[PDB]
Every structure is written in structure tokens, then in C-alpha cells.
Amino acid sequence: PAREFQRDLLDWFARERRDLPWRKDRDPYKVWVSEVMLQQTRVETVIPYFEQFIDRFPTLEALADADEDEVLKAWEGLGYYSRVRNLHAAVKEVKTRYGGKVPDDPDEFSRLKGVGPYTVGAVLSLAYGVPEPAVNGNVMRVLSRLFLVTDDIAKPSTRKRFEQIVREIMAYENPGAFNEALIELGALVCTPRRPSCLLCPVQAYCQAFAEGVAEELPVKMKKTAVKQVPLAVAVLADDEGRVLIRKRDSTGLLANLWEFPSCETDDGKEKLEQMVGLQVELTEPIVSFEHAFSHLVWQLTVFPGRLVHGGPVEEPYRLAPEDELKAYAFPVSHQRVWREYKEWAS
DNA sequence: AAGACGTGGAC
DNA sequence: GTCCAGTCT
Ligand SMILES: Nc1ncnc2[nH]cnc12
Ligand code: SF4
Ligand SMILES: [Ca+2]
């Protein structure tokens, strides 16, 4: 019922679509930025960040020209920071080799960093009307129920079948709305738990409702257990009130974000005190707390300490005043290190 | 193929 | 506690 569906869906969309910030216009830059911020992050959490981000980086060019350190700062607390580094590059590429005009050709836009199959379709379909499908988690949930597909949505293969299923039922007349409509539906109706089928605008066409198995779809593999990793962190202060920080390595975990000197303790303050060299003296642990990641959990332990000078501060390290820390981008884990330390000493 | 890659907010 | 939750390698 390719046509009956669209009509029922698109309409529901027209009257139920939320008035979200990135929906004010169809500007390719705005859309692209929100689509990237929304990856594995909830809309409510993204709204504030989006607004600040665009306020500070009004256009693709403004973003293109900004120092990456600023870019990270703007992303501070959002998670999966590699996303903004990829967007910063992609943009710099679009300014230089594309005349500041975001490609409207799948193959083209797709070569930019951070732009996978989903982004290509979301951005080009909503902003440029290109009929490419935009299949993400929500869409896969919706489609898997509508058509009763029981394949693991983890398999990129499934992503392709779902994508194929979109190429045949979408409303080629208005792809962008069809694609967002499908996404809103999964967001406000066809939810992960307790989907509201009784009031769904497309309940009809839903094989899953007919069979009473909607709450059992989509089929997903259960996440495995994550590694637990203890970490020693040093909060070193001068006599004048200056702390020691370093910029993490540009590749891997929390890439390019600043932090307080740390090291894996498989080791106590000994293992940490060693890494210092320097000229630092540490004492008993101020506190110990956890901090989860997708693939592991940090077992943190703070160690206070005085920093006596005796040489330059080079390498990744950097001497910084207290009224200047708030300018660096730190992971949520170390923002708590400082918070714990500051209330301790006060 | 499957692990790497943040962080928070419902149940 | 668990589920949610794209792209790069
Ligand atoms: N364009 C969009 N609008 C609302 N929620 C979304 N989640 C992912 N893309 C979205
Ligand atoms: S009927 Fe229920 S399960 Fe089917 S699409 Fe609508 S909300 Fe989703
Ligand atoms: Ca690509």
C-alpha cells in the first residue's frame, strides 16, 4: 500500500511533529550538525548543545575556521567526541575543496569524514530532497514491526534490507518529510517499550500489531560485559594556585580532550607518582568513584599533591590557573575529579 | 565482523 | 542494573 501509507504517515507528521531547533529551516549545515549530535544521544540532551553550537558556529564556514580546541569545548559533555572531530574535518573539506557548499550528491557527501549511510540519507533527504533512505535505530524499529522483519538489526545486512524496504515505499515526491516522519513516529509512537499502537497513524499496515508481537521487535543482540579499569589521577597545584593538566593523545579514548595526569593501576600512588617524572609529592586518595563508557568502566581514585617547580612544562602537559580551567575541554570523568577535589579543599 | 567510542535519563 | 544508542577500524 505504498501510497495509502505515505499519506497516513506524512499527515500524522504534519500535525504531530515536534517544533525542534534544527527544524526551523532546512539549511544543510544546521541539519548535518543536528544529525551528528543526535547519534546515540537523546533529543532533550541535544537541544541545549545544538543551540550553543550554532550560536557559536553560525555557518559551515565559521565552523571550518574555528580552532579545534574551541570545537571540542562546544562538544564538552556530549560524549563520543570523535564525532565533532570528524565533523570539523568534513566541514574544513567542504569549505576548501567544495566552495563551502555541502555536496548534494550521495557519493560525494559520503566521502566526508563522519558521514555514514545514515547521515548521507538524513542530511541529503531532509535538506536537499535527495531520495536516499535514512535508516537508523528508530527507523529500524518501525520498519521491523511494520513488516515483521526478525533479522538482527545489528547486522549491517539488516540495515540494507531495511534500506531496500525504504526505497520501495517512501514518498519519492517528498523524501525528507517521509524520512523524518518515519523517525518521529519511532520517537513518539513506535517506541522501544510499550509502543502506542492503538493510536498509531499507520497501525493498519502493521503486520506486527496484527500478530501481537510488536513489543518483541526489533531483534537485537544483548550487549556484552565491559572491562573494568582502575585509574590513578593526580591533581597537582602550585603555591600560587595552578594545576597540572595535559592534552590526551589525538588517537583513541577521549582524543584531544584535556585531563588531570593519570595512568592505569592494573600500583597505588607509586605507579602514578612515577609517571610524574617533574617534582610532585602526593598524599592519601581524596576519593574514589566510577565512570562508565560504552566499552569499559573507569575505577577512579584522586590523589592530591603539591607541584614544586624545577624545569619547563612541555610535552602534553600545561600549567594552568584555576580561573582558566573552565576554558579547557575535559571529559565528564575528570570534571568530577576537580569537583570532588574542590569541595574537599573548601 | 565486531570492538572502539561518552554520557545521561527513563524504567 | 538494563536499554537506548552511527561510523571508523
Ligand atoms: N531529524 C531528526 N529529528 C528528530 N529526531 C531525530 N533523531 C535523529 N534524527 C532526527
Ligand atoms: S502499530 Fe504499533 S508497532 Fe506498528 S508501527 Fe504503529 S506503533 Fe509501531
Ligand atoms: Ca562514508
Side-chain angles (χ1 to χ4, degrees), chain A residues 76-96:
Chain A
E76 183 181 45
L78 214 43
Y80 282 176
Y81 302 88
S82 166
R83 291 180 288 163
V84 80
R85 263 133 45 56
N86 291 166
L87 173 63
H88 195 188
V91 162
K92 282 177 183 306
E93 168 78 354
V94 168
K95 177 219 186 71
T96 68

Side-chain angles (χ1 to χ4, degrees), chain A residues 18-41 43-51 53-54 57-60 62-110 112 114-131 133-154 156 158-160 162-163 165-172 174-192 195-198 200-210 212-214 216-220 225-226 229-238 241-245:
Chain A
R18 291 163 296 177
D19 240 77
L20 297 175
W22 48 91
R23 276 170 189 179
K24 290 179 182 175
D25 61 56
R26 294 292 74 177
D27 167 16
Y29 173 56
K30 311 289 186 50
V31 174
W32 185 9
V33 177
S34 69
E35 288 300 337
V36 162
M37 293 192 151
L38 292 165
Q39 313 189 331
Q40 295 78 237
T41 316
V43 165
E44 289 66 49
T45 290
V46 167
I47 284 176
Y49 281 96
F50 177 79
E51 284 169 336
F53 193 91
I54 302 306
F57 306 121
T59 74
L60 180 161
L63 178 56
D65 299 319
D67 311 297
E68 183 165 290
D69 255 12
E70 173 162 44
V71 167
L72 269 176
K73 186 59 187 175
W75 212 265
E76 183 181 45
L78 214 43
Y80 282 176
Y81 302 88
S82 166
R83 291 180 288 163
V84 80
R85 263 133 45 56
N86 291 166
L87 173 63
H88 195 188
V91 162
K92 282 177 183 306
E93 168 78 354
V94 168
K95 177 219 186 71
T96 68
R97 265 164 284 296
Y98 282 113
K101 169 69 143 51
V102 176
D104 70 319
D105 177 77
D107 309 284
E108 300 192 305
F109 180 55
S110 191
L112 304 174
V115 184
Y118 170 75
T119 306
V120 178
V123 181
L124 296 185
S125 86
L126 330 190
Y128 284 140
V130 184
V135 174
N136 60 10
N138 287 179
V139 174
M140 287 195 279
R141 183 167 59 266
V142 170
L143 298 181
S144 83
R145 285 160 178 183
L146 280 179
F147 300 107
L148 205 61
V149 179
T150 58
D151 299 321
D152 200 312
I153 57 162
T158 306
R159 202 201 80 258
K160 302 181 181 195
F162 280 139
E163 281 185 293
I165 308 184
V166 169
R167 285 175 182 304
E168 94 186 17
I169 67 169
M170 92 169 83
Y172 277 83
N174 181 23
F178 183 79
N179 281 8
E180 258 205 309
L182 230 37
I183 293 164
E184 270 308 78
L185 188 63
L188 322 189
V189 181
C190 196
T191 53
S196 294
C197 317
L198 298 195
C200 169
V202 294
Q203 166 183 293
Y205 329 61
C206 181
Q207 296 176 36
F209 179 55
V213 307
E216 298 299 306
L217 292 186
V219 190
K220 314 176 86 303
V226 286
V229 184
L231 181 60
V233 188
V235 190
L236 309 171
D238 259 345
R242 276 177 298 188
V243 302
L244 183 75
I245 58 183

